[PDB]
Amino acid sequence: QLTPTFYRSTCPNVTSIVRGVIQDALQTDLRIPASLIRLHFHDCFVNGCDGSLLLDNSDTIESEKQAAPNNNSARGFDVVDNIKTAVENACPGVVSCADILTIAAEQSVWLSGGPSWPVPLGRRDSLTANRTLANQTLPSPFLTLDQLKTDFSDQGLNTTDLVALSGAHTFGRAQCQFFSQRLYNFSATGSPDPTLNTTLLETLRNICPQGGNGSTITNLDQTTPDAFDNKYFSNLQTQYGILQTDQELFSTKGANTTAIVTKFSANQSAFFNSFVASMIKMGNIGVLTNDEGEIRSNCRSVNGGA
Amino acid sequence: QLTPTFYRSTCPNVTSIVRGVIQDALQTDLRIPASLIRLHFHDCFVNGCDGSLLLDNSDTIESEKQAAPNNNSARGFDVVDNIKTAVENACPGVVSCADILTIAAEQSVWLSGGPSWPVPLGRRDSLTANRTLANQTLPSPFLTLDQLKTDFSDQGLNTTDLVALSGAHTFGRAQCQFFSQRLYNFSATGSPDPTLNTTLLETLRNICPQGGNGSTITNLDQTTPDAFDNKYFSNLQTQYGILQTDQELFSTKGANTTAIVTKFSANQSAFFNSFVASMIKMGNIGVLTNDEGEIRSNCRSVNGGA
C-alpha cells in the first residue's frame, strides 16, 4: 500500500529536501535528530502515523502536545514547520505532514551515523487528535518488561521490535522526572534500583537531587550521546541504562530480551537490520491512505477552520 | 617544628581514631573524603592551617564559612565535629582541630585509594577568623594560569605544588555556578570555551542550562569520580577538565605546567610522590605552635565565651 516511490513523479526530491532542512537545523541543535524520531513514534502510536501529534489546540482540537507523555517533553515542532515550508515551496499541496515526520525520522537516524533505508510513503494527515488516547497508549518509563511487551503488542509490534526500537535511546535526552524514582525510593522500597550501575547512580543523584528541578536533563546514552549506534545496548550490559524501561530489557530475571540485547551489543549490523525492519513496521500503524484525511498546508492546523 | 610523633605519648591512637570516624562517615556519604581535604586547604590558605574555617559566627567572630569561596560550598563540618568528639573521648584536651583537619585530609586521600604518608602534627587552634582574607586569597575558578601561580606563590607554593595539589580534583563535586561561564559566554566572547571537549560541553550544557539552578553539581573527575588517582590529569589531556583553572594547567599556550600534567597522566606514582610533598608543604603554612592559640574543646567555638 505505502511505497517508497509514492512521490517519484509529484515531488521527486522530497527526501533530499527534508534531509537538507535537518542538516541546517543541526547547525543550532545537536539534539534535533533524536527529537524528530521521537515525534514520529509518538505520532504512530496514537491512532497511527497520521500527523495527529502535530495539530495545535483549536475550537475543535485538544492537542496531543499536552498529553502527559508529550507535555514539556516533545519538541522539534518549529523544525517540522520548517521542513513543511521547504517541501511546500518545491511541491505545493503534495506531501503530507504524516510522511514528513516519517522521512524526518529516517534521515535523522542516517545523519546521526545510523542505517539508511527506503522509506515507504503515501500516508495522509488526520483531522483529529486524541489527548486521552496518547495518555493511555504511549508507554511510561515506569512500566515493567511484561507491561512494555503488552504496550507494543497492542500496536502490532513484537518482542524483537521492542528491543530494536528501544535502541533509539542511543541518542537524545531524558529529564530527571522520568528516572529519579530509581535513585532514592525505587518501587516503594526506600532504596535505589539495584540494576543501576552504582557509578551511574551517583552521577544521576548529583544532577537529580531529591527535592530539585525534575526538568534537568541527561543523555539517554552516556557513552555516545549523539551517535546512532549500538552503544545503547552495550550500556545495558554494564547497567548504564538511564530509564527503568531501558535497563529492564537486560536485567529482568529470565527475560528473552536479554539475549537480543547481548546480540545487538556485539553486532551493530544486526541491530541496524532489526531497527530498519521495526521502523518500517511502526511506520505502517493505523495509516490513512486513498482520500482518507488530507494533505495539510500547515502541520499545526486542519485545512480550513478550527 | 611539626612532627609526626607529636601525639605518640599523649594520644597514641589519634590517626586511627580519625580514620575510623571517616570510614563510618563514608557509609552515608561517598563524597566526604573530598569535602574534608577541601576544608583542610581552605583552612591553610587563610592565616595558615589553624582551624580558622571551623569557627562559627559569634559576638566576636564573623565566620569564614560565609566567605564567597566557602558559602553554600564548603561542607563536612558535622563530620569534623564527630572526629573531634571521638578524639576527645579517648584523649580529652590533647588534639587541636587544626591537626584533626590535617589528619582527616591525609586519611581521606588514603581511604580513597591515594598515597599514605606520615602526617606532621603539633598545630594549634586560632582564636580568630577572617572572612575578608578568605574572599581575597582563596583562588577563584575563573583565574588565569599566571594568576593561579601568583595565588599559590603568595602562600609559598610553587608551580609543581599548583599542579600536584590541583590533582585533589581527582574526586569530589563542583556546582554549575563555578564553570558555567565556559558553556555559553566565555570571557565575554559570546561563545563556549574552546578548550572544553565538545562532548563534555554538551554534557555540561544539559545539566547547567543557561537560566537554571547554578547549585546543581557534577563530578570534578568525570572518569573516576571518587577514586584518588591520576585520572584528573589524563582527563586534562582529552580536555575533560571541569573548572577553567583545571583545563588551563594543560591547554594554556606555552605553559610549563603542560609537561607536569602529561608526566602525572603517565606516571601515577610520580603524581602521588609530588602530591605528598606538596600536601606537607601546604600543611606547614602559617601554623601556630608552642602556647600560641589553644586546643579547642569544640571546633566551632573558642574556648570560653564568643
Ligand SMILES: *[C@@H]1O[C@H](CO)[C@@H](O[C@@H]2O[C@H](CO)[C@@H](O[C@@H]3O[C@H](CO[C@H]4O[C@H](CO)[C@@H](O)[C@H](O)[C@@H]4O)[C@@H](O)[C@H](O[C@H]4O[C@H](CO)[C@@H](O)[C@H](O)[C@@H]4O)[C@@H]3O[C@H]3OC[C@@H](O)[C@H](O)[C@H]3O)[C@H](O)[C@H]2NC(C)=O)[C@H](O[C@@H]2O[C@@H](C)[C@@H](O)[C@@H](O)[C@@H]2O)[C@H]1NC(C)=O
Ligand atoms: C479518545 O481515546 C479514548 C481512549 O481510547 C476513547 O475513549 C475510550 O473509548 C473506547 C471505545 O473506543 C471505550 O471502550 C469501550 O468501553 C465500553 C464501556 O466499558 C466499560 O463498561 C463495560 C461494561 O459495559 C466494562 O466491561 C468495561 O471494562 C468498562 O468498565 C465497552 O463496552 C467497550 O467494549 C465493547 O466494544 C469494544 C470495541 O471498542 C469491543 O472490543 C468489546 O469487546 C465490547 O463489545 C469498549 O471497551 C474497551 O476498553 C478498552 C480495552 O480494555 C478493550 O479492549 C475495549 O473493548 C473506552 O471506555 C473509552 N475510554 C475512556 C477513558 O473514555 C475516546 O473515545 C470516545 O469517547 C469515549 C468517552 C467513548 O464515548 C467512545 O465510544 C468514543 O469513541 C477517544 N475520543 C474520540 C473523540 O474518539
Ligand SMILES: *[C@@H]1O[C@H](CO)[C@@H](O[C@@H]2O[C@H](CO)[C@@H](O[C@@H]3O[C@H](CO[C@H]4O[C@H](CO)[C@@H](O)[C@H](O)[C@@H]4O)[C@@H](O)[C@H](O[C@H]4O[C@H](CO)[C@@H](O)[C@H](O)[C@@H]4O)[C@@H]3O[C@H]3OC[C@@H](O)[C@H](O)[C@H]3O)[C@H](O)[C@H]2NC(C)=O)[C@H](O[C@@H]2O[C@@H](C)[C@@H](O)[C@@H](O)[C@@H]2O)[C@H]1NC(C)=O
Ligand atoms: C582580615 O584580612 C584583611 C585582608 O587581608 C585585612 O585587611 C587588609 O589589611 C592589610 C594590612 O594587613 C591592608 O594592607 C595595608 O594597606 C595599607 C594601605 O594601603 C592603601 O594605601 C597605600 C598608600 O598609603 C597604597 O599603596 C595601597 O595600595 C592601598 O591603596 C598599606 O600602607 C600597607 O602597606 C604597608 O604595610 C605592609 C605590611 O602589611 C608592607 O608590606 C608595605 O610595604 C607597606 O609599608 C598594607 O598594604 C598591603 O596591600 C596588600 C598587598 O597588595 C601588599 O603586599 C600589602 O602591603 C589592607 O589594605 C587590608 N585590606 C582591606 C580590604 O581592608 C584585615 O586587616 C585588618 O583590617 C584592615 C581594615 C586594616 O585595619 C589592617 O591593618 C587590620 O590588620 C584582617 N582583619 C583582621 C581583624 O585582622
Ligand code: HEM
Ligand atoms: C519502549 C518504550 C519507551 C519508553 C518507556 C520511552 C520513554 C521515553 C522518555 C521518558 C524519554 C525522555 C523524554 C524527555 O525527557 O524529553 C524519551 C526520549 C526519547 N525517546 Fe523514548 N521511549 C520508548 C520508546 C521509544 C521509541 C520506540 C522511540 C523511537 C523509535 C523512542 C525515541 C526516543 C528519543 C530519540 C528520545 C530522546 C528525545 C529528545 O532528546 O528530544 N522512544 N523516551
Ligand code: HEM
Ligand atoms: C588550584 C586552585 C583551586 C581552585 C580554583 C579550586 C576551586 C574549587 C571549586 C570552585 C570547587 C567546587 C566547590 C563546590 O562546588 O562545592 C572545588 C572543589 C574541590 N576542591 Fe578545589 N580548588 C583549587 C585547589 C584545590 C586544592 C589545593 C585542593 C586540596 C588539596 C582542592 C580540593 C578540592 C576538592 C576535593 C573539591 C571537591 C569538594 C567537595 O566535593 O565537597 N582544591 N574546588
Ligand SMILES: *[C@@H]1O[C@H](CO)[C@@H](O[C@@H]2O[C@H](CO)[C@@H](O)[C@H](O)[C@H]2NC(C)=O)[C@H](O[C@@H]2O[C@@H](C)[C@@H](O)[C@@H](O)[C@@H]2O)[C@H]1NC(C)=O
Ligand atoms: C517480530 O517480527 C519480525 C517480522 O518483522 C520477525 O522476523 C521475521 O521472521 C519471519 C519468520 O517468522 C521471517 O520470514 C522474516 O524474514 C523475519 N524478518 C526479519 C526482519 O527478521 C521476528 O521473528 C524473530 O526474528 C527472526 C530473525 C527469526 O529468528 C524468528 O524465528 C524470530 O522469532 C518477530 N519476533 C518475534 C519475537 O516473534
Ligand SMILES: *[C@@H]1O[C@H](CO)[C@@H](O[C@@H]2O[C@H](CO)[C@@H](O)[C@H](O)[C@H]2NC(C)=O)[C@H](O[C@@H]2O[C@@H](C)[C@@H](O)[C@@H](O)[C@@H]2O)[C@H]1NC(C)=O
Ligand atoms: C559499572 O560500570 C563499570 C564501568 O563501566 C563496570 O566496570 C567495567 O566492566 C567491564 C566488564 O563488562 C570490564 O571489562 C571493565 O574492566 C570494568 N571497568 C572498570 C573501570 O571497572 C562495572 O562492571 C563491574 O565492576 C567491574 C570492576 C568488574 O568486576 C565487572 O565484572 C562488573 O560487572 C559496572 N557494573 C555492573 C554491575 O555492570
Ligand SMILES: *[C@@H]1O[C@H](CO)[C@@H](O[C@@H]2O[C@H](CO)[C@@H](O)[C@H](O)[C@H]2NC(C)=O)[C@H](O[C@@H]2O[C@@H](C)[C@@H](O)[C@@H](O)[C@@H]2O)[C@H]1NC(C)=O
Ligand atoms: C617546588 O618545590 C619543591 C620542593 O618541595 C621542589 O622539588 C625539590 O627540588 C629540590 C632541588 O631544587 C630537591 O632538593 C628536592 O629533593 C625536591 N623535592 C621534591 C619533593 O621533589 C620543586 O623543584 C622541581 O622538581 C624537582 C623534582 C626538581 O626536578 C627541580 O629541578 C624542579 O624545579 C619546586 N618546583 C619548582 C617549579 O621550583
Ligand SMILES: *[C@@H]1O[C@H](CO)[C@@H](O[C@@H]2O[C@H](CO)[C@@H](O)[C@H](O)[C@H]2NC(C)=O)[C@H](O[C@@H]2O[C@@H](C)[C@@H](O)[C@@H](O)[C@@H]2O)[C@H]1NC(C)=O
Ligand atoms: C574529546 O574526548 C574524546 C573522548 O575521550 C576524545 O577521543 C579520544 O581521544 C584519544 C586520544 O587521546 C583516542 O585514543 C581515542 O580513540 C578517542 N576516542 C573516541 C571515542 O573518539 C577526543 O579526542 C579527539 O577526537 C578523537 C576522535 C581523536 O581524533 C583525538 O585525536 C582528538 O584529540 C577529545 N577531544 C580533545 C580535543 O581532546
Ligand SMILES: *[C@@H]1O[C@H](CO)[C@@H](O)[C@H](O[C@@H]2O[C@@H](C)[C@@H](O)[C@@H](O)[C@@H]2O)[C@H]1NC(C)=O
Ligand atoms: C502542560 O504544561 C503546562 C506548562 O507549560 C501546564 O501549565 C499545563 O497545565 C494545565 O493547565 C494549567 C493552566 C493548569 O490548569 C493545570 O492543572 C493543567 O494541567 C499542562 N497541560 C496539561 C494538560 O497538563
Ligand SMILES: *[C@@H]1O[C@H](CO)[C@@H](O)[C@H](O[C@@H]2O[C@@H](C)[C@@H](O)[C@@H](O)[C@@H]2O)[C@H]1NC(C)=O
Ligand atoms: C551565604 O549564603 C546564605 C544562603 O544560605 C545567604 O542567605 C547569605 O546572604 C547574606 O545574608 C542575607 C540575609 C542577605 O543579607 C545577603 O545579602 C547576604 O549576602 C550568605 N552570606 C554571605 C556573607 O554571602
Ligand SMILES: *[C@@H]1O[C@H](CO)[C@@H](O)[C@H](O)[C@H]1NC(C)=O
Ligand atoms: C527548572 O525550573 C525553572 C524555574 O521555572 C525553569 O525555568 C526551568 O525550565 C526548569 N528546568 C531546568 C532544566 O532548569
Ligand SMILES: *[C@@H]1O[C@H](CO)[C@@H](O)[C@H](O)[C@H]1NC(C)=O
Ligand atoms: C519474547 O516475548 C514473547 C512473550 O514471552 C514471546 O512470545 C516472543 O516469542 C519472545 N521473543 C524472543 C526473541 O525470544
Ligand SMILES: *[C@@H]1O[C@H](CO)[C@@H](O)[C@H](O)[C@H]1NC(C)=O
Ligand atoms: C536549587 O534551588 C532550589 C530552590 O530553593 C534549592 O532548594 C536547591 O538547594 C538548589 N540546588 C539544587 C542542586 O537543586
Ligand SMILES: *[C@@H]1O[C@H](CO)[C@@H](O)[C@H](O)[C@H]1NC(C)=O
Ligand atoms: C613554572 O612557572 C614558574 C613561572 O614561570 C617558573 O619559575 C617555575 O620554575 C616553573 N616550573 C616548572 C616545573 O617548569
Ligand SMILES: *[C@H]1O[C@H](CO)[C@@H](O)[C@H](O)[C@H]1NC(C)=O
Ligand atoms: C518511599 O519511602 C517510604 C518507604 O520505605 C514511604 O514512607 C514512602 O511512601 C515511599 N515513597 C513513595 C513515593 O511511595
Ligand SMILES: *[C@H]1O[C@H](CO)[C@@H](O)[C@H](O)[C@H]1NC(C)=O
Ligand atoms: C556575553 O554576551 C555578549 C557578548 O557577545 C554581551 O552582550 C554580554 O555582556 C556578555 N555576557 C557577560 C556576562 O559579560
